[PDB]
Design a binder for this molecule. Structure first.
Ligand SMILES: *[C@@H]1O[C@H](CO)[C@@H](O[C@@H]2O[C@H](CO)[C@@H](O[C@@H]3O[C@H](CO)[C@@H](O)[C@H](O[C@H]4O[C@H](CO)[C@@H](O)[C@H](O)[C@@H]4O[C@H]4O[C@H](CO)[C@@H](O)[C@H](O)[C@@H]4O[C@H]4O[C@H](CO)[C@@H](O)[C@H](O)[C@@H]4O)[C@@H]3O)[C@H](O)[C@H]2NC(C)=O)[C@H](O)[C@H]1NC(C)=O
Ligand SMILES: *Cc1cc2c(c(*)c1C)N[C@]1(NC(=O)NC1=O)C(=O)N2C[C@H](O)[C@H](O)[C@H](O)COP(=O)(O)OP(=O)(O)OC[C@H]1O[C@@H](n2cnc3c(N)ncnc32)[C@H](O)[C@@H]1O
Ligand SMILES: *[C@@H]1O[C@H](CO)[C@@H](O)[C@H](O)[C@H]1NC(C)=O
Length: 498
């Protein structure tokens, strides 16, 4: 009996299923559903939601759930593009980690222990409060949870300088399928490697991450400038952008958000420099004068301020608000990684397609810099040297546009097909933090599929992990041979014939 088990172990914060919009259950379920695509009444719902308040409670929660037949779901920030932290085709218990959001900074070692329910914003805020000369490399969305994000890699505006969040993890506490509480020494190097990018919801429950804090200057420079242009100019800008993104030294990042509506194209240029505005502007004046940036576009501020600003927040304080919703639209997104430069026609066609669907947008990031200096097998994220760009295609809509859902999905499908020739091939590469079920999924309830799970899974597995897929399967067998942590695209354990 689950409830008696939780009570016996003093895991007191839990609620059982109820449809009442008023119920604490429904409120907690919806609190961290960060893609409204998955909020409706016909979606699968948990039989109970448990909010463990310590590593011991998390351990005992897993143990209690194991006594029954339920599927475990872990949720940190709830940002799964495919809602995989709070949906399941089989009855399930949702372990919501929002109360495990403590950040402990050690300024003597310049490291931090970060409970896995902490959001990126909570982490950034904690760091800024402790020091004006330390930061951390992770994504730009402040409400993303560290649990999912670091488990999948974690790319952001400082990745060209410092790599992924997962590339800067030096220890972690993993709670395994039997509730065992394991640090790096206890879990071993294969498992410690797998958790640093091998995907959330696969290895066990991360309780906390120990991260290395990273130097930042007291003043950095950023800009966020939207150019309103026509398609010919936008194409010229994007085509040159891909090279500048690369010719820039690691102390600079220039990224782009873009979209259109008939004749009008908008390109939002996001810039970050590890340094002062005189140097930042001089560099873009020389390398990319076509951007037409002026002195007033460049803002000098602290690292903490810069991360709040790039996210469009009003204040650094807002980083610490995990429930602040800046964009409450349902969305679907796909992503590509490139190995060869994109021809101008690829950007032209992308822009033409965006002009026909104003609810669509693209997000463009260059790799290079430190991303090319990290070996493909340092952590499970393999897209290092030779990888040029990450290109994201997004379509998003509010509730008033819900009837157009299929139209938006059609547009996104067509955009991804259009880009096929220009982007990585054999296989077409992906990124596990941009999990995409279009690639397929495992029905763990189907014996025939399960027998063939490894090779069925190679489709998306090689896309996300390339040559690292094999070691991930070895690590999965080590830490979760009974496949307690599973989802449609989780790494399968090795075939066993005992
Ligand atoms: C399972 O987990 C969930 C998720 O964590 C739990 O739900 C959370 O429960 C929290 C309470 O335990 C609740 O926090 C509350 O959040 C509200 C905002 O919605 C916040 O205003 C509350 O903060 C007040 O109360 C706490 C003590 O509970 C104080 O520490 C705090 O200082 C606040 O009191 C002050 O402000 C109040 C007005 O807001 C005044 O009425 C009060 O007098 C006091 O004012 C004095 O101090 C002020 C500051 O110096 C000063 O300005 C003033 O003049 C006075 O001197 C409270 O923290 C969360 O909202 C809730 N989270 C969610 C998602 O629902 C849940 O309880 C758990 N369930 C179980 C079974 O354990
Ligand atoms: C919603 C959103 C997502 C992203 C971005 C912004 C916004 C608003 N921006 C990103 N773009 C970038 O270039 N960099 C960004 O950060 C982006 O990539 N992005 C997607 C997120 O990074 C990922 O979706 C990330 O995995 C989400 O993390 P989180 O909020 O924790 O997501 P969850 O749905 O709770 O979990 C994801 C998977 O991981 C498992 N999991 C959660 N917590 C776990 C712990 N503690 N241990 C083990 N596994 C855990 C979940 O079960 C789920 O499978
Ligand atoms: C199991 O999977 C196989 C392969 O996808 C499929 O042919 C079959 O219909 C499935 N069986 C069940 C019980 O759904």
């Amino acid at each position: 009996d689950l409830l008696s088990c939780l009570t016996f172990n003093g895991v007191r914060n839990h609620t059982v299923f109820s449809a009442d919009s008023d119920s604490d259950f429904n409120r907690f379920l919806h609190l961290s559903i960060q893609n409204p695509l998955f909020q409706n009444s016909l979606i699968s719902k948990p039989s109970a939601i448990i909010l463990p308040g310590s590593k011991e409670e998390l351990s005992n929660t897993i143990r209690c759930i194991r006594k029954g037949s339920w599927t475990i779901r872990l949720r940190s920030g709830g940002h799964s593009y495919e809602g995989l932290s709070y949906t399941s085709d089989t009855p399930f218990i949702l372990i919501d980690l929002m109360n495990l959001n403590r950040v402990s900074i050690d300024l003597e070692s310049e490291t931090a222990w970060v409970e896995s329910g902490s959001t990126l914003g909570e982490l950034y805020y904690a760091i800024t409060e402790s020091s004006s000369k330390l930061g951390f490399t992770a994504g730009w969305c402040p409400t993303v949870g560290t649990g999912g994000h670091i488990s999948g890699g974690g790319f952001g505006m400082m990745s060209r300088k410092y790599g992924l969040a997962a590339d800067n993890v030096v220890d972690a506490i993993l709670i395994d399928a039997n509730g065992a509480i394991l640090d790096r020494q206890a879990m071993g190097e294969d498992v410690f490697w797998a958790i640093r990018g091998g995907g959330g919801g696969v290895w066990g429950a991360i309780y906390a991450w120990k991260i290395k804090l990273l130097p930042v200057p007291e003043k950095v420079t950023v800009f966020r400038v939207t150019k309103n242009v026509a398609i010919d100019e936008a194409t010229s800008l994007l085509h040159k952008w891909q090279f500048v993104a690369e010719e820039l030294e690691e102390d600079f990042t220039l990224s782009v958000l873009g979209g259109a509506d008939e004749k009008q194209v908008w390109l939002t240029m996001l810039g970050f420099h590890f340094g002062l505005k005189t140097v930042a502007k001089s560099t873009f004046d020389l390398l990319f004068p076509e951007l037409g940036l002026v002195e007033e576009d460049y803002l000098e501020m602290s690292w903490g301020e810069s991360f709040a600003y790039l996210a469009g927040l009003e204040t650094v304080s807002q980083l610490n608000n995990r429930f602040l919703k800046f964009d409450e639209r349902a969305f679907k997104t796909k992503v590509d990684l490139t190995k060869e430069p994109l021809p101008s026609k690829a950007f032209y066609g992308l822009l033409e397609r965006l002009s026909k669907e104003p609810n669509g947008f693209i997000a463009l990031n260059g790799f290079g810099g430190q991303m090319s200096k990290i070996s493909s097998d340092f952590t499970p994220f393999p897209h290092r040297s030779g990888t040029r760009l990450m290109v994201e295609y997004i379509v998003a809509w509010n509730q008033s546009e819900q009837k157009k859902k299929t139209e938006f999905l059609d547009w996104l499908e067509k955009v991804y097909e259009f880009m096929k020739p220009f982007v990585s091939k054999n296989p077409r590469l992906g990124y596990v933090n941009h999990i995409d079920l279009d690639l397929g999924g495992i029905d763990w309830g189907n014996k025939t599929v399960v027998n063939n799970a490894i090779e069925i899974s190679r489709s998306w597995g090689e896309s996300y992990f390339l040559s690292n897929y094999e070691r991930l399967i070895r690590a999965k067998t080590l830490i979760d041979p009974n496949n307690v942590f599973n989802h449609p695209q989780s790494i399968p354990p090795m075939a066993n014939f005992d």
